[PDB]
Amino acid sequence: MFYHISLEHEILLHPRYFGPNLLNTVKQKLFTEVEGTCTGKYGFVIAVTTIDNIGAGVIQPGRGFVLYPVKYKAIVFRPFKGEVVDAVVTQVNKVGLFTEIGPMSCFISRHSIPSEMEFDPNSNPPCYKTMDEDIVIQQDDEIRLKIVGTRVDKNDIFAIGSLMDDYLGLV
Amino acid sequence: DPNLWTVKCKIGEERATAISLMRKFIAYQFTDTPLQIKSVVAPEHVKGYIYVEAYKQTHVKQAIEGVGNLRLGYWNQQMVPIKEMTDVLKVVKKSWVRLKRGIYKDDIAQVDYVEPSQNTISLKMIPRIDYDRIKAPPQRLFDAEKIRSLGGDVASDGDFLIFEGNRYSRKFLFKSFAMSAVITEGVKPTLSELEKFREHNFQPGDNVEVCEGELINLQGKILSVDGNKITIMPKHEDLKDMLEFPAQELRKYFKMGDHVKVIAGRFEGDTGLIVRVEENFVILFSDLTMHELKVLPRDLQLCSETASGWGELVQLDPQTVGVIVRLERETFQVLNMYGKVVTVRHQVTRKKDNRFAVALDSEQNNIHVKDIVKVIDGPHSGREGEIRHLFRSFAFLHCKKLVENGGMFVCKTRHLVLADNELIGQTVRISQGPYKGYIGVVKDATESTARVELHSTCQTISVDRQRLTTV
Amino acid sequence: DGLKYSLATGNWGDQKKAHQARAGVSQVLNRLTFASTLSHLRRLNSPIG
C-alpha cells in the first residue's frame, strides 16, 4: 500500500556540477536515482513527494566528492501478506495468472487458483472460467486477491494472489 | 596385589619384547639375578609400549635391564592407576571384503569362490595399474588389448589372463588372497560398487510434528539430534517448555508455502515450495521448473538458501566455439553456434572471451553483451533473451523462462533487434646522428623510434628508426 | 658430512644442538684486497659469553 514516509539517501556530488544550480543539481540527481527503483525491505518507491531537508555537504578526504545526505518525503508501495488488494490481471496462461499492483507483479499459481476456476484455451480470449460463469478471470480485469506471501528476491517483490476466501475476484 | 607399570617400547615390536623377557625370566629363574617381576602384558591394539606387573619401580628397572627395546622407558616408569587396571585387558569388537596390504589396500573386492581349505579365497577386483607404461593409480576396467600390446610379463588364454606378478584376471581381476589379508566383516559397499560388481536424518531448524502419543499434533522446530533415540528438544507452537520425542515418534511435517529441499532420491538437490500436504504424498514445484514433484514427508528439509540451478565459453574445435549448457560428472553438455546440443569430454579449450565485442542486430543497431534482444527471425522467432556470448555472426541468448538447455539458445546476429615489431632484438648500427659509429641491440621498437641497448656504454637510449642500419 | 656441515654454515656443535651450540667460527674468506684477506686470516673473535 502507498505510504507517505520520510527516507534518507546519499549523493556523492562530483566537483564538475558545483557552482550555480548546485541545490538544483542534487535535487535532480535524487529524482533520477530514487525514481524507478525497488528495495526489498521498503518495497517500490513510487515518486518523490518532496525533498524535505538538505544535509550538510561533507567534503570527502582523499576523494574529492562531496557527500550530501537528504531527507525526502516519498510514497512507497509495501505489499502486506494477509491483505486483499485490487489488482489488474496482465498475463493469463494455462499454468497461472500474473497481476499488476502498481509497478509490482504478483502471481496466482495453478493451485492457488480456485479449483472451481478452469482455463478456457479453446475460446478466443484465453481465460479462467467457473462452471456457472459468475466470475471469469481474464487479462485486463479488476480482481480482489488476497496476498498469501510477499516473496522477495534481490530488490524485487513478487507476491502470491489467492481467491480461496469468499467475496474475492471480480466486482 | 602388585601394580602395573608402563614401559615405552619399540613401535611394532612389543610382542617380541614380551617373548624375549619371558625367555630371560626362564633363563635366569635359578640364578643369583632373579627377575622379581610377576607378568608382562603386550596388548594387541596398544602399540608403542607394554606393561609390567610388580610391587616396585626398582623391580621394573632391574628387570628390564639388558633390553634395548625398552631403553626409552629405562630411566623412569609410570604406574597404571589402581582404578583403571580392568581397562588394560578390556577388549571390544558372495560377500565383499577389502584387501589389507599391496596396492589394493582398502579396495572393495567381491568374494567369488571360498576355498574350503581355509587358507585363501578368490576375490574379484578392479585393477589399479598403469599397464606397464609409467613404472620402470585409480580404478579402471581391465583392458586386455592394451596389456597384450605393451608386452612384458603377460600370458593370454582369451579372456583369461596372467600378468605382472602372477595377477590373474578374466574379462576384471580374479585372484586368491588370505582371509587374514582382508576384512570379512563391516564393508557395506554402496550402489556404485554393486554396479561395478532404515535411516533417520533430522537437522536443527527443521519443523516436525507428532504422529502418536499423548502429545500428538504438536509442530515444533528441531534444536538437537542424536543417533537413534534422539530425545529431541522441539520448540512447539504456544509452549515455552521443551518436551521429549525419539526419532520414531516424529515425522518431517511442513506447512504449505515454505522453502523445501530434498535430502535424497530422484528429486535430490532440487528446491521449491510444497503446495498441499496429503497423508504421505507431498507435492511441490521447483524454483527452476514448474513440474509436479511428489515426495515423502521424510524426503523434505527446511533450508532457506536459494537454488543453485555455469555457462562458460569453450572451444569444440578451432572452427566452432561452444557454450556449456550443463555440467555433469565426466562430460559437458555444450550448445554450439549451430544450435546443436552435444556432449563432449572434459579434455575442449577455454577461449578468451571478448566482452567488448560489437555486433549488429537486424536493424543496424549496435548490441553488446548483457543486452536484452528480441528474436524477430529464425527458428527462435518471438522469444526475447539476454546476450551472453558473441561470435562473428552468432549470438547466444539466455532466458530464465525457457526451461531448455538452462535457458540458453543461439541465433544469428542479423536476426535480432535491441529492445610485435620485426626490429626487436636485432643487432643495429647507428648510421646517422651524434651516436654514429656504435653498435647496439634493439630492446623496444615503435613506429617512429626504438630503444637500443648500447653495447659501447653502460646505458640504453632511444633513436629514430631512420638512424638505424642493421648488421 | 658433519665437518662439512659445521664449516658450511658456521654453526659449531652438533647440528640438532643448534639452540645453544656456539656459532660464528667458519666464515666466507674476505676476497676484496690482499690486505683484507690477510686481515681476515689473522682475525680473532672474543664471544660475548
Next chain:
DNA sequence: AGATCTGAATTTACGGGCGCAACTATGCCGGACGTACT
C-alpha cells in the same frame, strides 16, 4: 598468665625484554619395506 594458632611484614627464584637497511651460504627424510628385474 600462658599457649597456640594465626594473620600481615621480610627474603629468594624467575620471565622478559635488549636503535635502523642490503648481500652471501646452507638446509629443510632416513629406515624399513616390498617387490621386480637379471
Next chain:
DNA sequence: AGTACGTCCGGCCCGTAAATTCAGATCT
C-alpha cells in the same frame, strides 16, 4: 636369489608470587 630403487610412515630489574614470623583474637 641379491641388491638397487623408489615410495611410504614417523647481567640487571621489577613486578610477582609464595614461604615464614609477632600481636591480636579467642580461649582457655
Next chain:
RNA sequence: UUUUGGCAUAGUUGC
C-alpha cells in the same frame, strides 16, 4: 596474445 613468486636463523659490511 603479459612477466612474478619462498620463509627462516647465522655471518660480514656501511652513518
